Amino acid sequence: KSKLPKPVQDLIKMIFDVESMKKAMVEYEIDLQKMPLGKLSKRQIQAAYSILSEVQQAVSQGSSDSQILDLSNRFYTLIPHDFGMKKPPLLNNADSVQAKAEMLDNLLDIEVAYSLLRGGSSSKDPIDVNYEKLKTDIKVVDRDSEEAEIIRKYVKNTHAAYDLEVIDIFKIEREGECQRYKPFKQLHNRRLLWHGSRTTNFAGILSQGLRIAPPEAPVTGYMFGKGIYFADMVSKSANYCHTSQGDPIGLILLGEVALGNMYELKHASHISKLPKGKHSVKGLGKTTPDPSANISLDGVDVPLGTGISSGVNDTSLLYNEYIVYDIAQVNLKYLLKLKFNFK
Ligand SMILES: NC(=O)c1cc(F)cc2[nH]c(-c3cc4c(s3)CNCC4)nc12
Numbered sequence: 595k596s597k598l599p600k601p602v603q604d605l606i607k608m609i610f611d612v613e614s615m616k617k618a619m620v621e622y623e624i625d626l627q628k629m630p631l632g633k634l635s636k637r638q639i640q641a642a643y644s645i646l647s648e649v650q651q652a653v654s655q656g657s658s659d660s661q662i663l664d665l666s667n668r669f670y671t672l673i674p675h676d677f678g679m680k681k682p683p684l685l686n687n688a689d690s691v692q693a694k695a696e697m698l699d700n701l702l703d704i705e706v707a708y709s710l711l712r713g714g715s716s717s718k719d720p721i722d723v724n725y726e727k728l729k730t731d732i733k734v735v736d737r738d739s740e741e742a743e744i745i746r747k748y749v750k751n752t753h754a755a756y757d758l759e760v761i762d763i764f765k766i767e768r769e770g771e772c773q774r775y776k777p778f779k780q781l782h783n784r785r786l787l788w789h790g791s792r793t794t795n796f797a798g799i800l801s802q803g804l805r806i807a808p809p810e811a812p813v814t815g816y817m818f819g820k821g822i823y824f825a826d827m828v829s830k831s832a833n834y835c836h837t838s839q840g841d842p843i844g845l846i847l848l849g850e851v852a853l854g855n856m857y858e859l860k861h862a863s864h865i866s867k868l869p870k871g872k873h874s875v876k877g878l879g880k881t882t883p884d885p886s887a888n889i890s891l892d893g894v895d896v897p898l899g900t901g902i903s904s905g906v907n908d909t910s911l912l913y914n915e916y917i918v919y920d921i922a923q924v925n926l927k928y929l930l931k932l933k934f935n936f937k
Contacts, residue, residue, distance in 0.1 A: 596719035599734050601762040603721045605931065608843075609796040610711050610724050615704050618794050622697050628674035632712070634705040638672065639698050643810035645669045646698070650691045650812045662686050669694065692815040699807070703798030710797055728800045729770075735763040735928070744891050745848065745928060748786075748898040752827040752883060757935040761843070764929040768803055775925040778852035781873060786896045786927065787824035787916055788831035789847040796845050796929075804849070804924050818875045819865035821917035822924055824851055826883055826897045830913045832932065839936045848928035850894045851918060860909050868919065878906045879913035894927075 596603055608614075615631055649665045666685035675682060685691060710727045725732070735742050742763050749758055791799060807813075807820040825831040828846070835844030854873030857865075865875060884899030904914075918924065 596721040596725075598721060598725060601734050601931070602725070602732050602764070605732065605762070605764065605929075606721050606725050608793060609800075609845075610707060612708070612711070614794055615708060618700060618704060618792075622701075623675050623677050625674040625676040628676075631704070631708055634701060634708070636702065636705060639702050639705070640808070640810055642669060642673050642698055643695070643808060643812070645672060646685070646691050646695050647810060647812050649685050650688070650814055653686060653688065653691070659686075673698075688814050691812050695812045695814065698811070700792060700794060703792075703795035706801065707794070707797035710801060728797065729768065730800045731767040732929070733765045735765050741765075741891070744889065744896060744898070745930070748848075748896060749828050749930075749932075751887075751898050751900045752788075752829065754827065754829050754881070754901055755936065756832075756842075757937060758828060758832065759933040759935060760930055761933050762931040764931075766800070766926055766929050768800060768926055771803060771925055774922045775850075775852070778920075778923050781852040781854035781923075783853040783856065783874075784894050785826070785851055785853060785916070786848055786891060786894045787826060787851050788828050789822070789824050789849055790831035790834035790844070791847075792834075792836050793843075793845050799847070800929075803921060803926065804847075805921060806919070813864055816864065817862045818859065818877060818915075818917045819863075819919075821865065821875070821919045822921065824849060824916045825913060826916070827881075827901070827913045830915065832934070835932075835934075837934045839934075842934040842936060844932050844934060846930045846932055847926055848930070850925040850927050851916060852923045852925075853916060853918070856916075860906060860911075862910070865917070865919065873918070873923070875917040877911050877915040877917070878904065878909055879911040879915070880904060880906065880909050881913055 645668050652662050652665055670682050745763055746760050749760055804822045837844040855871055856874050856876040857868055857872040858876045858878055860878050881901045882904040883897040884902045887899030889896050
């Protein structure tokens with residue numbers, strides 16, 4: 595049996611849960627006979643990304659439907675689906691490419707999880723064995739600490755279709771992140787920010803850290819180009835947990851992010867290089883946390899102030915977001931297990 599505290603053991607169970615992996619592939623309508631969970635290829639996913647990028651290129655120009663259909667067909671030939679009574683949906687627009695790209699993102703992290711879970715060598719509990727494979731130190735933050743109270747206040751005030759309840763707070767330290775982050779600790783404007791993702795991605799996120807979309811992947815849906823995205827509103831990030839009322843539990847990260855000088859934008863702009871002297875993008879929202887209630891936690895700004903009007907004139911965004919284009923600018927500090935109370 596395992597030496598780990600019960601919440602840590604349950605975290606390990608939920609992120610390595612194989613039923614959840616197969617359930618995800620079934621909901622994507624993947625043919626599990628043609629492409630089993632155990633036979634996912636990073637190389638196969640890579641090629642699929644490029645097909646999707648070519649599809650998006652064709653769509654953007656305006657191309658022969660015969661060309662769009664041959665590309666769309668090439669994708670489903672590479673990634674095998676079983677749509678039952680229906681015909682495969684034609685990949686001929688932006689929303690459709692994005693959905694399939696976001697599905698590839700998820701499949702890659704599932705492959706990382708299943709690879710971790712299958713690999714390795716008797717005396718130890720499988721919970722402990724699989725814990726160590728995350729290369730991440732995970733401690734339970736006590737409910738009656740200033741840390742947990744600051745964090746719980748952050749969840750209450752920046753929650754603006756569900757109520758949010760914090761079940762467990764874990765303090766986390768990924769191997770190598772301390773060293774990788776240390777130069778960026780010199781930048782001013784360090785902020786504690788939210789980052790949400792599906793539960794089936796968290797074995798990948800913890801072993802590899804938050805990553806940037808590969809260049810093969812379509813840029814569709816990335817308002818500010820390929821980067822790592824964060825919110826100062828727990829609601830905005832919690833939507834990326836994709837939590838179903840079937841299983842109303844999600845996982846969400848708090849990261850220390852070294853923003854430096856922010857390139858502040860009101861509208862979509864696919865970034866490929868920041869201006870000199872800029873180290874992050876800030877998307878400006880209609881609503882921002884009240885800056886008078888900014889508090890500090892271990893030298894990092896926590897923007898937990900309740901939502902007020904920002905006064906930004908012509909904004910496309912309801913809330914702020916923050917993007918960095920270097921993976922070393924992120925120091926993952928906490929992992930929250932959240933209960934979504936839908937109402
Ligand atoms: N995860 C977050 O917490 C988050 C927070 C934000 F404030 C804005 C975000 N945007 C995204 C995107 C993820 C993906 C996109 S946008 C486009 N297609 C591939 C996958 N995540 C956030």
